[PDB]
Amino acid sequence: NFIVLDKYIKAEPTGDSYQSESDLERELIQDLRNQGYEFISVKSQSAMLANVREQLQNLNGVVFNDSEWRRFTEQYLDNPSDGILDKTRKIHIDYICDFIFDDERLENIYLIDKKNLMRNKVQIIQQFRYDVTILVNGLPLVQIELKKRGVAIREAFNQINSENSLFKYLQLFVISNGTDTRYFANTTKRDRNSFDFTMNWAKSDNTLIKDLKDFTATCFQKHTLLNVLVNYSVFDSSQTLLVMRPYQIAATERILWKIKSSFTAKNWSKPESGGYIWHTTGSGKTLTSFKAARLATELDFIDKVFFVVDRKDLDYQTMKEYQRFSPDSVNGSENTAGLKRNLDKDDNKIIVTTIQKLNNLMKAESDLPVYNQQVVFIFDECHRSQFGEAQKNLKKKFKRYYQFGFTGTPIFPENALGSETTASVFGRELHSYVITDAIRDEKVLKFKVDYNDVRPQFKSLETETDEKKLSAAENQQAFLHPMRIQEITQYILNNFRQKTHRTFPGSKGFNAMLAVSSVDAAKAYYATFKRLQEEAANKSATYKPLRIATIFSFAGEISDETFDTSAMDSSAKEFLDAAIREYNSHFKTNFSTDSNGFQNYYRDLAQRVKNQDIDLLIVVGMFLTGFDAPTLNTLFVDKNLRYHGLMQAFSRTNRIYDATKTFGNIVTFRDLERSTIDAITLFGDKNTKNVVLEKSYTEYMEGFTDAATGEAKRGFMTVVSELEQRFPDPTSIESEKEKKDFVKLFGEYLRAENILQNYDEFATLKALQQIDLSDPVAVEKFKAEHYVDDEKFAELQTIRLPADRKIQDYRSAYNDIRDWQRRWDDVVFEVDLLKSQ
Ligand SMILES: Nc1ncnc2c1ncn2[C@@H]1O[C@H](COP(=O)(O)OP(=O)(O)OP(=O)(O)O)[C@@H](O)[C@H]1O
Ligand SMILES: [Mg+2]
Numbered sequence: 118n119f120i121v122l123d124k125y126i127k128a129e130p131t132g133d134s135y136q137s138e139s140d141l142e143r144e145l146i147q148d149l150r151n152q153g154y155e156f157i158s159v160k161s162q163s164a165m166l167a168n169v170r171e172q173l174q175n176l177n178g179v180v181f182n183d184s185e186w187r188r189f190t191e192q193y194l195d196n197p198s199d200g201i202l203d204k205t206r207k208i209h210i211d212y213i214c215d216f217i218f219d220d221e222r223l224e225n226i227y228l229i230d231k232k233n234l235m236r237n238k239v240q241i242i243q244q245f246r247y248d249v250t251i252l253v254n255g256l257p258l259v260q261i262e263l264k265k266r267g268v269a270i271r272e273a274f275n276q277i278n279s280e281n282s283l284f285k286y287l288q289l290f291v292i293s294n295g296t297d298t299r300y301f302a303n304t305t306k307r308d309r310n311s312f313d314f315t316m317n318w319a320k321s322d323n324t325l326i327k328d329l330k331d332f333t334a335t336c337f338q339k340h341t342l343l344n345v346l347v348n349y350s351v352f353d354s355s356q357t358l359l360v361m362r363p364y365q366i367a368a369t370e371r372i373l374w375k376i377k378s379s380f381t382a383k384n385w386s387k388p389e390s391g392g393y394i395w396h397t398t399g400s401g402k403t404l405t406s407f408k409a410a411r412l413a414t415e416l417d418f419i420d421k422v423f424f425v426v427d428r429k430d431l432d433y434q435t436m437k438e439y440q441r442f443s444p445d446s447v448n449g450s451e452n453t454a455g456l457k458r459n460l461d462k463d464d465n466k467i468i469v470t471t472i473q474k475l476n477n478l479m480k481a482e483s484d485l486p487v488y489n490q491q492v493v494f495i496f497d498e499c500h501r502s503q504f505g506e507a508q509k510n511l512k513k514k515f516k517r518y519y520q521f522g523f524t525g526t527p528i529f530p531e532n533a534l535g536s537e538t539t540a541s542v543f544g545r546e547l548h549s550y551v552i553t554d555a556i557r558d559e560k561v562l563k564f565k566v567d568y569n570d571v572r573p574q575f576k577s578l579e580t581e582t583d584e585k586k587l588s589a590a591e592n593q594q595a596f597l598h599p600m601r602i603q604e605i606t607q608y609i610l611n612n613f614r615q616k617t618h619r620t621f622p623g624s625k626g627f628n629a630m631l632a633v634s635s636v637d638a639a640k641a642y643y644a645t646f647k648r649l650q651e652e653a654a655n656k657s658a659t660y661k662p663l664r665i666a667t668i669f670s671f672a673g674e675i676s677d678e679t680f681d682t683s684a685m686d687s688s689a690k691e692f693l694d695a696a697i698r699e700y701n702s703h704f705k706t707n708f709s710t711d712s713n714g715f716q717n718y719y720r721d722l723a724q725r726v727k728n729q730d731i732d733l734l735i736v737v738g739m740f741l742t743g744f745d746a747p748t749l750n751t752l753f754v755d756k757n758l759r760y761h762g763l764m765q766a767f768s769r770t771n772r773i774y775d776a777t778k779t780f781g782n783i784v785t786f787r788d789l790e791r792s793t794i795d796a797i798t799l800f801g802d803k804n805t806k807n808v809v810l811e812k813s814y815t816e817y818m819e820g821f822t823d824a825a826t827g828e829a830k831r832g833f834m835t836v837v838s839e840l841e842q843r844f845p846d847p848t849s850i851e852s853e854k855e856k857k858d859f860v861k862l863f864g865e866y867l868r869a870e871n872i873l874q875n876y877d878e879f880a881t882l883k884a885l886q887q888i889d890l891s892d893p894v895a896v897e898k899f900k901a902e903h904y905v906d907d908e909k910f911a912e913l914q915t916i917r918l919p920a921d922r923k924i925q926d927y928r929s930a931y932n933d934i935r936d937w938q939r940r941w942d943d944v945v946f947e948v949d950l951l952k953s954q
Pocket of ligand 1: 309314359360361362365397398399400401402403404405498525742743744745747768772
C-alpha cells in the first residue's frame with residue numbers, strides 16, 4: 118500500500134462554485150470530512166489546549182488532574198521558551214515525555230503513536246486570511262493556506278512561532294490557489310526558504326497532482342499524510358527539517374516493499390531480490406538513500422542495514438551527519454577498526470561506511486557473524502572500480518542479502534567500459550526520476566556550457582580529440598604553458614564577479630570552482646593567481662582580492678585521490694604544505710600535512726566553500742562528485758571530462774537556491790561541447806540536450822520559443838523597447854492599470870537582465886557603457902580585457918541600452934508599487950531579484 122500511487126483517477130468538480138477562497142475552503146473541509154477528519158470549532162488557545170488534553174489522554178489511556186496537566190503543559194508541551202525548532206525536535210525525536218504524576222507514578226506520554234499510525238486522531242479546524250489547520254492528537258501539524266483562483270501561487274508564497282504558541286508545532290505547510298497546490302517544510306532556517314523548494318504531490322510516474330481536489334484526495338488521505346509527517350520528513354543534526362518529494366518517497370517505499378516481499382518468499386541474495394533507483398544527479402540521492410536505510414532498520418526481520426557511500430563523495434554536513442550513527446567510522450582512511458566495532462554494537466541495526474572500508478574489511482575478514490545474518494545493502498553513487506571488488510566479495514560472503522543502489526548515471530551496455538551494468542548487478546529498476554523530469558519540476562538547474570575561445574595559439578591544443586596526445590600534452594610547452602595559464606587566470610580574475618553575480622553593489626551572490634587536469638596545473642594556477650593579484654594590488658588600493666584555496670592529493674571516470682598524502686611526490690607535497698600554511702595564516706587554523714590534519718583540512722575547506730569563506734576553489738579531482746554547495750553557481754574547467762564524470766562534475770552547479778541563481782555556469786578552456794552533448798545524450802535521448810542546455814545570447818536578447826512548454830519569450834531588447842515606448846514616466850503611470858502592466862513588464866526586464874548577467878557578450882556590452890570620450894587607454898584596455906576586435910567594437914556602439922539612471926528610477930518605482938501593494942491577482946513581484954539590488 119504505497120503512498121505514492123501507481124494509478125490515480127482524476128476527480129470531478131462538484132460543482133458548485135470553485136472560484137472564491139471560501140469555496141475552496143468549503144470543498145476542502147467537506148472532502149477532508151469524507152476522508153475521516155473530524156471538524157471542530159476552536160476559537161482560542163484555551164479551547165485548543167483542552168482538545169489536546171482530551172486527545173492525548175485518550176491516546177495514552179491516562180487522565181491528568183488540573184495540576185498535572187498544567188505542569189505537563191508548562192514543562193513539556195507548551196514551554197514558553199520553546200521555538201519552532203524545539204517543537205520539531207519534539208515531534209521527530211522527543212515525542213515521548215516520561216511524566217511524574219502527583220501520586221508519584223511514572224508513565225510515558227506520547228505526542229504521536231508512530232508504531233501504529235492510524236490510532237492517531239486527525240482533526241480539522243478553520244481560521245480563528247483563509248486557512249485550514251490539520252491537528253494530529255490536537256497538535257496542529259498542517260497548515261493549508263487558501264488563495265483565490267486568480268492569485269498567482271508564487272506571489273501567494275511571496276506574501277506569507279510567537280502566539281498562539283501551539284502553532285509552533287507546525288511541521289508541514291501547504292498553499293493552494295485551487296489550480297495548484299504546493300507543500301513545504303516549516304522551519305526557521307532561511308537558506309531553503311525560497312519558492313524553489315515548494316513541491317507538487319505526484320504519482321510514481323512523477324505525473325504532477327496540481328489541483329486542490331486531487332491533492333486532498335491523495336496527499337491528504339490520512340495514511341498518506343501521517344506517513345509523510347512521521348516517516349517521510351527528515352530532521353538532520355543541524356536541526357533542519359526537510360520534507361521529501363514524491364519521487365524520493367516512491368523510491369524509498371518501493372525499496373521497503375521489495376525487501377519485505379523478497380523476505381516472505383525466502384528469495385534472497387540474487388539480483389531479483391533487490392533493485393536499483395535511477396535518480397538524476399542532484400535530485401537528492403544521498404538524502405533519500407540514507408533515509409531509506411534508516412527506515413529499513415525498522416523491519417524486525419532484518420538483522421543489519423549497511424548504508425555505504427564513496428569517500429570521494431564526503432563533505433562537511435554529510436560527515437557531521439554520519440558521525441552520530443557511526444562514530445569515527447566514516448572517513449578517507451583505509452581503517453576497518455571503526456567499521457568492525459560498529460558491527461559488534463548490541464541492539465543496533467544501522468552501519469554507515471565507505472565502499473573502500475567495506476571492501477577492505479570483506480577482503481581481510483572471513484568468519485564475521487553478519488555474513489550469516491539477514492542483511493540489507495544500500496549503495497549511494499559508488500564509483501565502478503571499488504564497487505566491482507566489493508561486489509565480488511559481497512556475493513562470495515554474505516549468504517542472505519538484499520542489495521539496492523542509487524545512481525544518477527547508470528551503467529548501460531554501451532558505456533560498460535569493462536564493468537558490469539547496473540541492471541545486471543541490482544536487477545530491476547524500482548523507480549526512476551530522470552534529468553528531464555527534474556528540470557521540468559525545477560528541482561534541478563540547467564547548464565550553460567561554453568568554450569571560451571580567446572586563445573588562437575593554444576586553440577588546436579584545446580581542441581584535441583586524441584587520448585594519447587592529451588596525456589602527452591601536460592607540460593610547460595603545451596597545456597601548462599605560462600601564457601595560457603596567465604590568460605586563463607586573467608580571464609577568471611576579470612570575469613569572476615560577473616559570472617558569480619557579485620557585480621551590482623551590495624550583492625551577496627555566489628562562488629565558483631576551478632577544475633583542472635593535474636597537480637602541476639593546480640600549482641601553476643594557484644601561483645599565477647597570487648602573482649596577478651599582487652600586481653593588481655599594486656595597481657590599485659581600491660582592489661578587492663579573491664580568496665583562493667586548493668586541495669588535491671594523489672591518483673569517463675574521474676580519478677580518485679587518496680587521503681594519504683605520503684603517496685605524493687616532494688614537489689606537490691611541499692606546494693600543498695605551503696598552501697595549507699597560507700590557508701592557516703589567513704583563517705587562523707592549525708591543519709597539518711599528516712593524515713589527520715589533511716582530513717580536517719578537507720572538512721574545513723568543504724565548509725568554507727559551502728558558506729563562501731573561500732571565493733574560488735582550485736581542485737583536481739576532489740569535490741567533483743558529491744559536494745553540496747547551493748551557493749556555488751560557476752564551474753571553470755580546464756580538464757578533459759566525459760560521460761558520467763562530465764555530468765557529475767558539471768552538476769556541482771546544479772543545486773537550486775532562488776530566483777537569483779538561474780542556472781549553473783560551465784566555463785571551459787578546452788572544447789567540451791561534443792563531450793557535453795554525448796554525455797547528456799547517453800543519460801537521456803537525442804532531445805535531452807535541448808531541455809538541459811540553456812539557449813544562446815542572441816535568443817535571450819531578441820526572443821525565442823521554448824519547446825517543452827511551448828511558450829514564446831521576449832526578448833530583452835523587446836522588453837527594453839516596450840519599457841521606453843510604453844513607460845517614459847512618471848506620467849506613463851498614474852492609473853492602476855498602468856501600474857500593473859508596468860510591474861509585469863519590469864518583472865520581465867529584471868528576469869532577463871538577471872539571465873543575461875551570465876553571458877560574456879552582455880557583460881561586454883554593459884562594460885562598453887563607460888570607456889571613451891578622449892583618452893583611449895581604457896578603450897584598448899576594454900578591447901584587450903573583453904577580447905573584442907575593432908570590427909565588433911564598432912557595432913557595439915550602435916546598440917542602445919537604457920540609461921543607468923532611468924533603470925534606477927524604474928526599480929524604485931517598482932519597489933514603491935510593491936510596498937503599496939502590501940497595504941492584482943495575476944501579478945508576481947520579483948522579491949528575490951529586488952532584495953539583492
Ligand atoms: N526533499 C528535499 N527537501 C529539501 N531539500 C532537499 C530535498 N532533497 C534534496 N534537497 C537538497 O538538495 C541538495 C542536494 O542533495 P543531495 O546531495 O542528496 O543530492 P544528490 O542527488 O545526492 O547529489 P549528487 O548527485 O551530487 O550526489 C541538498 O543540499 C539537499 O539539502
Ligand atoms: Mg550526494
